[PDB]
Assembly symmetry: C2
Homo-oligomer: 200 residues x 2
């Protein structure tokens, strides 16, 4: 099966979600040696803001697209197709300013596509990604889970994933990381424990 | 007083939030002819993703910054200073894929600055923008207000604004815009009514 490994942290080697997302994937490889991993670092290779140009490019035939529109169209196509081909997705999702990084949301904007990841039915709109397994690696300085302050982070992500039909979702959480090295260490230790004995 | 008028819609002339945000501001001008308006179209002039480079640039002295770092540093400085100088802010905030546009979040990333719009106290973190009045122009295809699906949109915005200490907040809402021209018309009519007789 195909595992899509997504990171969105801007903290490089000091990143919590990058460490944990890699550990999830390594554990996954161990449990299933046949898994084929595809990596996308949304911070190192940032996806352009979903723009008016993104919309225009989509509604313009290839033969008449200019260079900028070919860029947008290809960016949209390769991101979407990469996601569609994935059977499992591990997503590094830090909380920056009470929500996900724009680098991650820009990716969401490219994978939320009518007729592909969800569809509008005379009955309403249904997700088409029910076969995909998602492991969300959620990291935050404070402790916001289950509180109103967590709305733009995990609550939002659960909403979007639910919309495109994800039912098989696990959340590997390491929060309260801002509260000092001991709280940070335990938060990560607990996340690692979850990975080792509660995922596979 | 200084009114900062922010738009983030990518729909140009077909934009609901652009129409309503302009109408809020025009009404404000009418009620207070001395108001000085500053406009920033976050879609037309998109702010770069808050990146590792944004962080590095901040921690590098001007005399040793390269061109890219001067760009990031200036972008951070001019956005923040523009917000700090504003006494009132009108914000156009569409829901794109269950949250705000990345164009708007990228702006949030530049105005959320420790020691400037909030601060960390031995007692915890307090907003410093209590003197600013905010009018949020909230537009959405569906009806999500007060529902879990609204978490990444209005709930998130209320969280962020609260964090930086905004207490004087009004929300001009036009939702259910996807439900056809009649529902769309009334939603906007009601928003206009609010503007005309419930703001000033």
């Amino acid at each position: 099966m195909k595992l899509l490994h997504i990171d969105s942290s801007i903290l490089g080697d000091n990143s919590a979600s990058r460490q944990l997302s890699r550990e999830v994937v390594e554990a996954w490889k161990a449990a299933d040696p046949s898994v084929e991993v595809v990596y996308r670092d949304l911070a190192a290779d940032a996806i352009a803001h979903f723009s008016a140009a993104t919309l225009v490019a989509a509604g313009t035939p290839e033969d008449v697209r200019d260079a900028a529109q070919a860029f947008e169209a290809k960016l949209s196509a390769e991101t979407l197709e990469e996601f569609l081909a994935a059977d499992a997705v591990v997503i590094g999702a830090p909380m920056y300013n009470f929500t996900v990084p724009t680098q991650l949301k820009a990716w969401i904007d490219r994978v939320a596509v009518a007729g592909k990841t969800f569809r509008y039915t005379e009955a309403g709109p249904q997700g088409l990604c029910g076969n995909k397994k998602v492991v969300l690696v959620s990291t935050a300085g404070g402790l916001h889970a289950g509180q109103p302050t967590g709305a733009g982070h995990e609550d939002f992500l659960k909403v979007f994933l639910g919309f495109i039909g994800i039912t098989d979702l696990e959340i590997v959480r390491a929060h309260g990381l801002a509260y000092g090295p001991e709280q940070r260490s335990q938060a990560i230790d607990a996340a690692q424990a979850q990975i080792a004995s509660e995922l596979f």
